[PDB]
Structure formats: C-alpha cells, structure tokens
C-alpha cells in the first residue's frame, strides 16, 4: 500500500536537441535517479545516465529535432549503506515527448 515509484515526471523546457525534465521523489532514500531515453518504438537500445538523489531535475542532451522520445526515471535505493553498490531499483515512471523541429528564436 503505496508504490515505490517517482511521480509527476514532466518536460519543463525543450529545445530541438535537448529536454529539461523534472519529477517528485518516490518513498524511501534515493542515492541516484537513473534516467533512460530512446526513440519511441525504435528497436535501438535506450541510453541511460544518473543524477544524484538530492536532485529532482535533469537535462537530456544530444537529441534529434522533431523526434518522439520515451523518457523513463527510476530511483536507485540503497539497502543499507548509502555509499555501497548494493541497491534495488524502484518501479519506472515514463512519458513520451516529441522534440521541437526549430528553436523559438531564429
């Protein structure tokens, strides 16, 4: 009763090649948030990176204009020692978002 999942994942600002994303913490201590992204439907594996657990935002760089992306956020929860490799992942939270074709200013 209460899911281990981050919440309110959204794109705050977007550019043709970039996305600024934000989310709310899941229950339980988070050492890192693992952010995965890839083209929607495409059989290409997803790219991933981490941001410290003290953060609730991340920037996804090096994207293509006018392309649909699936963005997923997991939380990496330590079992006991916060600086240990023993951790379990939360359930994922994901959104689909198309990058703009052009920047707002010419």
């Amino acid at each position: 009763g209460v899911s281990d999942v981050p919440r309110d994942l959204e794109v705050v600002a977007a550019t043709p090649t970039s996305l600024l994303i934000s989310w709310d913490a899941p229950p339980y201590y988070v050492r890192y948030y693992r952010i995965t992204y890839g083209e929607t439907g495409g059989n290409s594996p997803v790219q991933e990176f981490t941001v410290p657990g003290s953060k609730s935002t991340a920037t996804i760089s090096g994207l293509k204009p006018g392309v649909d992306y699936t963005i997923t956020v997991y939380a990496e929860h330590p079992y006991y020692d916060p600086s240990s490799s023993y951790y379990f992942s939360s359930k994922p939270i994901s959104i689909n978002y198309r990058t703009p074709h052009h920047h707002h200013h010419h």
């Binding site: 009763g1 209460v2 229950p27 339980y28 201590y29 657990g53 330590p78 079992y79 023993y86 379990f88």
Partner: protein, 384 residues
C-alpha cells in the same frame, strides 16, 4: 520467568493500557499517545497502598485484583517493574522515575514511604504548588535529571494545587537488532493530515522483517526486533493518510494476535521519522472514567495511609515519556543483500500517523502502546 501473580497482573495491565489508549484517542484534543502499562498499573498500586475504604478498593477493582491479597498486588506489580527494567537488553535504554509530590504542610507516613519505595521505587517531595515558578522548576528539573535531559518538561502548569501529584518520568530508546546506517537520513514531509505536512528527518534501511499488508483493511503491520530479540517494536499504519480512529477501533488483543499470526518473513524497506517525541499525559480524568472516582475527588478521597492530612486527594497522575527514534542498533552481516529473498523489497514508508507497541518476547508483556500523530517540526510550505 514471571510468577503467576505477576503474569496475571501483566495481562490486566495491558488490558488497562488498551482501555486508556482508546479513551484518550476519542479525546480529540490529544495528538500523540504513549502509555507504559506497568507504570499505569503501579500508579493504581500506589493509590491502593496509600488508600483506605472505597478509595483503595476502587484501585484494586481497576487491576481486577480483588481476588488477590493486598500485599500480593504490591509484590506482583513490584516483580513486574523490576523484570522490565532488567530483562530488556543492555543496549536498549529505559529510564523510569516515580515521585509523589505533596503540599508543604504534609508529612508522609514512614510505613507508606517504606513500602512505596520497596515495591514501586517511589520518591517523595513536599512542594508549594501555588508558587508555580518554583513548583514547575522542581517537577521539570527532577524529570529532566531522571531522563538525562531527554524529557526536559513534564507540564507547563499545575492545574490542581490542593492535593498529591504523582509524576512518572520516562525515556525509552529502542536499540534495533539490525541497525540503520547513520548516513541514510534525508528530509521529508510527514503528513499529519491530508492538508497539514511537517518537515522531519527520516531514517531508512532494508532487511528481513515479519510483515503483513492487508489489502482489504488497507493497513500494513511490521515487527522490528530490538537488541538480541528480547523485545520488538510493532508498527501498524493505514495505507494512506487518514485519522487513526478506523484502525484503533479494529485494534484489540484478539485482532493483534491474528495480525501477528499472519505476518511472514519478507524484505521490507523501512522509513521512519527520526528524533525525540515528548508525550505527557495527566491520566487523572481518564483513570476516573475507568473506576477510580473516589481518589480523584477532594471530598470523597481517603489517602490516610499516605498521610494523616485528610482531604488529600489524587490531583494528578502525570505519565511523561521521551521516546527516541534513532538509527542506533547492533551490527549485522551485509552479505544478506546479495541473497535472492531481498531482490524486491516491499515498502513501509511511515510518512503519516501510525500506531506502535513495544512487546517483551520473553514474557509476552506489553511495554508500550502509543501512536505518532505529530512529530517535532515546523509546518511545510512551498507555494504561498
């Protein structure tokens, strides 16, 4: 092990503590609750020891000890108090002090002072309750010295200044059988209600714990063993933020047994608020509601064995406790986190009001019953 007289009195003490818990939970003014059954029972035992006529018999009637002899009640309760301040593991902290305060113009009898000291470790003090700066300073500094500064204040006022004041000051700090790491702490919002949130520090750890999630009744229950598994802290919490009333009504001796029988050994990721919770109750009006009507009445009280004062009555029964939630506990083998049974923990995220009990596993006696509704902290506010 406990003798037959002490075992039946431990069972009656738990019944009495559940009854006070339910009556106090109905009082909408009360937020946190913290009762130690043996301290509540020893307070009635002191009334029986210092009383005569229906004042002492009503105290025995609440403990259902009308079949037992007078000295058997004091020996039985005396045995229970010693057994809990000895059988609980060395690393588990439990400080308790009991003091009877009478007015300046009162002489306590030698026999009452001797037996109250022998069975209940009761201390005695004479005080001018009307000089409230001096009276409060004496009560609060005694309670602070008893608890090593953990409970620095029993009360902010003495409401009734013309009788005896019984004060029980305690400090309990559960030392876990498997410690939490002191660095796995973060700041979170504790939801007192669906619209009131307070900023708290939370401590986190995952381990194998006896656990039960009732989807029908929308509650979770976990048992956290204390040092050497000689006692355990049981936490009962609704799935989401809600007034504890619905769960408190379900909670009985029989239902807690069914819930404990349904617990299974599972990987649980536990998050708890970290800090000291100071809970003080004047149990005078609640003890009257359970049978102790004469002792608390200025005209009908008969505390003549306590003092020849006459017209002396039980003006207050302070039950003051500092309960510390902390990471401290025993070390354990961390290789457990590489085993299959911990691949997917369930979460016990106590960010909203919960009920808790501390039980001695050797005798099955109830050490504490309470609820954490309002931890220490300021109301959170982001957008204004």
């Amino acid at each position: 092990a406990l003798s037959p007289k002490a075992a039946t009195l431990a069972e009656r003490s738990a019944g009495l503590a559940f009854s006070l818990y339910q009556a106090m939970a109905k009082d909408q003014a009360v937020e946190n609750i913290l009762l130690s059954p043996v301290v509540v029972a020893s307070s009635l035992g002191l009334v029986s020891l210092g009383g005569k006529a229906t004042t002492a018999s009503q105290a025995k009637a609440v403990l259902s000890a009308e079949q037992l002899r007078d000295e058997e009640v004091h020996a039985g309760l005396g045995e229970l108090l010693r057994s809990l301040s000895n059988s609980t593991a060395r690393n588990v902290t439990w400080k308790l002090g009991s003091r009877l305060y009478g007015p300046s113009s009162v002489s306590f009898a030698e026999d009452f002072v001797r037996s109250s000291k022998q069975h209940y470790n009761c201390e005695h003090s004479k005080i001018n309750f009307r000089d409230k700066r001096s009276a409060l300073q004496s009560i609060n500094e005694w309670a602070a010295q008893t608890t090593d500064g953990k409970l620095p204040e029993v009360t902010k006022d003495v409401e009734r200044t013309d009788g005896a004041l019984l004060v029980n000051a305690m400090f309990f700090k559960p030392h876990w059988d498997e410690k939490f790491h002191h660095k796995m702490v973060d700041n979170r919002g504790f939801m007192v209600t669906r619209s009131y949130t307070v900023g708290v520090t939370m401590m986190h750890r995952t381990g194998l714990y006896n656990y039960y999630d009732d989807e029908k009744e929308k509650l979770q229950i976990v048992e956290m063993p204390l040092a050497h598994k000689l006692s355990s802290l049981i936490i009962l919490m609704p799935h989401h933020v809600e007034p504890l009333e619905r769960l408190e009504k379900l909670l009985t001796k029989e239902q807690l047994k069914i819930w404990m029988g349904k617990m299974q050994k599972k990987a649980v990721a536990i998050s708890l608020p970290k800090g000291v919770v100071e809970v003080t109750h004047d149990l005078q009006k609640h003890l009257a509601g359970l049978g102790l009507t004469e002792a608390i009445d200025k005209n009908k009280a008969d505390l003549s064995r306590m003092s020849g004062k006459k017209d002396l009555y039980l003006a207050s029964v302070f039950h003051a406790t500092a309960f510390e939630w902390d990471t401290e506990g025993n070390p354990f083998d961390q290789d457990i986190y590489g085993r299959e049974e911990l691949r997917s923990p369930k979460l016990f995220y106590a960010d909203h009001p919960f009920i808790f009990l501390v039980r001695d596993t050797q005798s099955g006696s109830l050490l504490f019953i309470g609820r954490l509704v309002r931890p220490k902290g300021d109301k959170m506010r982001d957008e204004l």
